[PDB]
Amino acid sequence: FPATV
Amino acid sequence: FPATV
Amino acid sequence: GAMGSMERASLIQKAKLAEQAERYEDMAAFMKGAVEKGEELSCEERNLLSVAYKNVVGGQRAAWRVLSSIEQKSNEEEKGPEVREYREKVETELQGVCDTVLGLLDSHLIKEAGDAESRVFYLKMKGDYYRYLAEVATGDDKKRIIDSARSAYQEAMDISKKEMPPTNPIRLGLALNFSVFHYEIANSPEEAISLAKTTFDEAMADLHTLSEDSYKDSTLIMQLLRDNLTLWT
Amino acid sequence: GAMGSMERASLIQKAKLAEQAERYEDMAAFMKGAVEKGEELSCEERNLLSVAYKNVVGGQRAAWRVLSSIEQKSNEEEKGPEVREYREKVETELQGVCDTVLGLLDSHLIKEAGDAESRVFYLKMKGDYYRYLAEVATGDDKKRIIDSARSAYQEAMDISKKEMPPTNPIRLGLALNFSVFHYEIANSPEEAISLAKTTFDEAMADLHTLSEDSYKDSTLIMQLLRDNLTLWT
Numbered sequence: 217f218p219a220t221v
Numbered sequence: 222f223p224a225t226v
Numbered sequence: 227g228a229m230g231s232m233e234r235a236s237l238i239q240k241a242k243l244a245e246q247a248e249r250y251e252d253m254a255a256f257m258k259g260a261v262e263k264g265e266e267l268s269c270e271e272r273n274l275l276s277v278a279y280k281n282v283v284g285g286q287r288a289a290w291r292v293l294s295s296i297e298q299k300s301n302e303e304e305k306g307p308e309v310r311e312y313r314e315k316v317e318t319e320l321q322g323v324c325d326t327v328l329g330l331l332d333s334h335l336i337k338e339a340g341d342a343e344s345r346v347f348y349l350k351m352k353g354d355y356y357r358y359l360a361e362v363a364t365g366d367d368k369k370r371i372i373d374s375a376r377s378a379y380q381e382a383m384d385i386s387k388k389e390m391p392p393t394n395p396i397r398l399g400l401a402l403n404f405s406v407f408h409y410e411i412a413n414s415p416e417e418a419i420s421l422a423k424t425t426f427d428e429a430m431a432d433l434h435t436l437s438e439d440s441y442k443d444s445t446l447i448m449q450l451l452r453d454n455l456t457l458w459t
Numbered sequence: 460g461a462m463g464s465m466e467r468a469s470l471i472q473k474a475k476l477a478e479q480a481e482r483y484e485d486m487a488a489f490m491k492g493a494v495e496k497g498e499e500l501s502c503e504e505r506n507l508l509s510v511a512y513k514n515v516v517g518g519q520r521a522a523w524r525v526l527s528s529i530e531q532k533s534n535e536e537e538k539g540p541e542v543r544e545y546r547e548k549v550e551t552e553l554q555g556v557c558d559t560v561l562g563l564l565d566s567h568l569i570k571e572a573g574d575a576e577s578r579v580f581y582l583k584m585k586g587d588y589y590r591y592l593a594e595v596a597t598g599d600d601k602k603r604i605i606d607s608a609r610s611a612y613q614e615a616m617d618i619s620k621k622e623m624p625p626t627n628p629i630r631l632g633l634a635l636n637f638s639v640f641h642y643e644i645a646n647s648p649e650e651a652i653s654l655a656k657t658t659f660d661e662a663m664a665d666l667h668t669l670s671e672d673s674y675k676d677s678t679l680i681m682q683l684l685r686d687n688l689t690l691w692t
C-alpha cells in the first residue's frame with residue numbers, strides 16, 4: 217500500500 | 222516485563 | 227446487552243473476524259455477548275474470550291504504565307492535575323474491563339464449569355483480572371484484591387495438580403501466571419522462582435508421553451517459564 | 460461536547476500524553492475538544508490533530524481491508540450475512556470518523572485559515588478524509604465523494620505552488636497524498652507518476668537553500684515520493 221502522510 | 226499467557 | 231439480538235453462532239463468527247482484523251475491543255464485545263447467552267463455552271470459545279480481553283486489558287496496562295511513569299517523574303516543574311487525571315481515566319477504564327470479565331466469570335461461567343479444563347481456565351482468568359486490579363490498587367482494598375487473585379490461582383492450582391498432567395498447557399499457563407503474581411504482586415520472588423522451576427521440571431519429565439503437536443504446545447509455555455527464570459536469577 | 464468543560468490547554472496537554480501512551484482514540488477526542496474551543500490551531504496543534512485522526516482512521520482502514528478481502532473471497536461456501544454485516548459495521552464507524560474530521564474542517568477550521576501553511580494543511584486533510592470515504596464508497600455518491608477529494612487537493616495544490624517553496628514539507632506531503640489519490644482513487648496512474656516525479660525533481664533543485672534540519676524534513680518526504688514511484692514503475 218503506497219505511502220501517505 | 223515477565224511473560225504471562 | 228447491545229448483543230442480545232444477535233445469534234450466539236453469529237457472535238462467535240464475528241469474534242473470529244474481529245480477531246483477524248485485530249479489532250480486539252469488538253472481539254471482546256462479541257464474546258461478552260456470546261457468554262451472556264447463558265450456555266457453557268467450548269474450548270475454542272473460551273480461548274476467543276481470553277484472547278479478546280487479554281488484548282484489550284494488555285493495551286490499557288501498557289498505557290497506564292506509560293502514564294504512571296510520567297506521573298512519578300512529575301513528583302520527583304508543577305504541570306497541574308492533568309497527568310494524574312488522565313492516568314486516572316485510563317485506570318478507571320482498565321478497572322471497568324476487569325470488572326466486566328470478573329462479572330462474566332461470576333455470572334455464571336465458573337459455577338457451571340465442572341470439567342477440570344474449563345474450571346481451571348476460568349479460575350486462572352479470575353486470578354489474572356484480580357492481578358490487573360492489584361497492579362493499580364493503592365487504597366484500603368489492595369490487600370483484599372491481592373488475596374482474591376491468590377485465592378483464585380490457588381483453587382486453580384489445586385484442581386490442576388489433581389486432574390491434569392504436568393504438561394497440560396492450561397496447567398502450565400496457570401503456573402506461569404501465578405509465578406508472576408508471586409514475583410510482581412505478592413512480593414514473593416522466592417515463591418515465584420520455586421513455582422516456575424518446579425513446574426518446568428515436572429513438565430520436562432512428562433514430555434515423553436506426548437505427540438509431536440502436544441510437545442510443541444507444552445514446550446512453548448515451558449520456554450516462557452525459563453524466560454522468566456532467566457529474568458529473575 | 461464531552462470535552463466542553465475542560466480547558467483548552469489541558470486538552471492539548473492530554474493529547475500529548477495520549478500520544479505517548481499510544482491512546483489515539485483518546486488523543487483524537489482531546490484534539491476534537493480543543494478544536495471546538497473555537498480558536499485557531501498552532502502548527503504543533505494542527506499536527507496533533509492530524510496524527511490522532513490518521514492513526515484512528517488508519518486502524519479502521521486496515522480492518523476494513525481485511526474484512527473486505529474475506530467478504531470478496533466468500534463471493535467467489537455460503538456463511539450467511541455476518542461477514543458483510545461486520546464489514547458494514549467497521550465501514551460505518553470509519554465513515555463516522557471521516558465525517559467528524561470533515562466537520563471540524565468545515566466548522567470552522569478552513570474558513571479561519573488565512574496563512575498558506577494552515578490553509579494548505581487543512582485542505583490536504585479535507586482531501587485525505589474524502590479519499591478515505593472514497594475508498595469504501597460503492598453507491599450513487601461515489602463520483603461526488605471523489606470529486607470532493609480532488610477539489611480540496613487541487614485548491615491546496617494551487618495555494619502551495621503560489622505561496623510555499625517546493626521543499627516545504629506540507630507542500631511535499633500534499634503532493635504525495637494527491638499523487639496517491641490519482642493512482643488509487645481516480646484511476647489516473649500516469650497523473651500520479653507525473654505528479655510524484657515533478658514534485659521530487661522540483662524539491663531536489665531547492666534543497667540547496669535549506670538548513671541541515673530542514674533538509675532532513677524535506678528529504679524524508681522526498682524518499683516517500685521515490686518509494687511510491689518505485690512501486691508504480
Ligand SMILES: *CC(=O)NCC1CCN(C(=O)[C@]2(Nc3ccc(Cl)cc3)CC[C@H](N)CC2)CC1
Nearest residue numbers: 226269270272273347350395396397399400443
Ligand atoms: C481449551 C483450552 O483452554 N486450551 C488451551 C490452549 C493451549 C494452547 N494455547 C496457548 O498456548 C496460548 N494461550 C494460553 C492461554 C491460557 C493458558 Cl492457561 C495457556 C495458554 C496461545 C498461543 C500463545 N503463543 C501461547 C499461549 C491456547 C490455549
Ligand SMILES: *CC(=O)NCC1CCN(C(=O)[C@]2(Nc3ccc(Cl)cc3)CC[C@H](N)CC2)CC1
Nearest residue numbers: 221502503505506580583628629630632633676
Ligand atoms: C505546521 C506544520 O504543518 N508542519 C509540518 C510538519 C512537517 C514535518 N512532519 C512530517 O514530516 C510528518 N507529517 C506530515 C504531515 C502532513 C504533511 Cl502535509 C507533511 C508531513 C510526520 C513525521 C513523519 N515521519 C513524516 C511526515 C510533521 C508536520
Ligand SMILES: [Mg+2]
Nearest residue numbers: 314317318362
Ligand atoms: Mg483510581
Ligand SMILES: [Mg+2]
Nearest residue numbers: 417420421424
Ligand atoms: Mg509448592
Ligand SMILES: [Mg+2]
Nearest residue numbers: 547550551595
Ligand atoms: Mg455501507
Ligand SMILES: [Mg+2]
Nearest residue numbers: 650653654657
Ligand atoms: Mg501539472
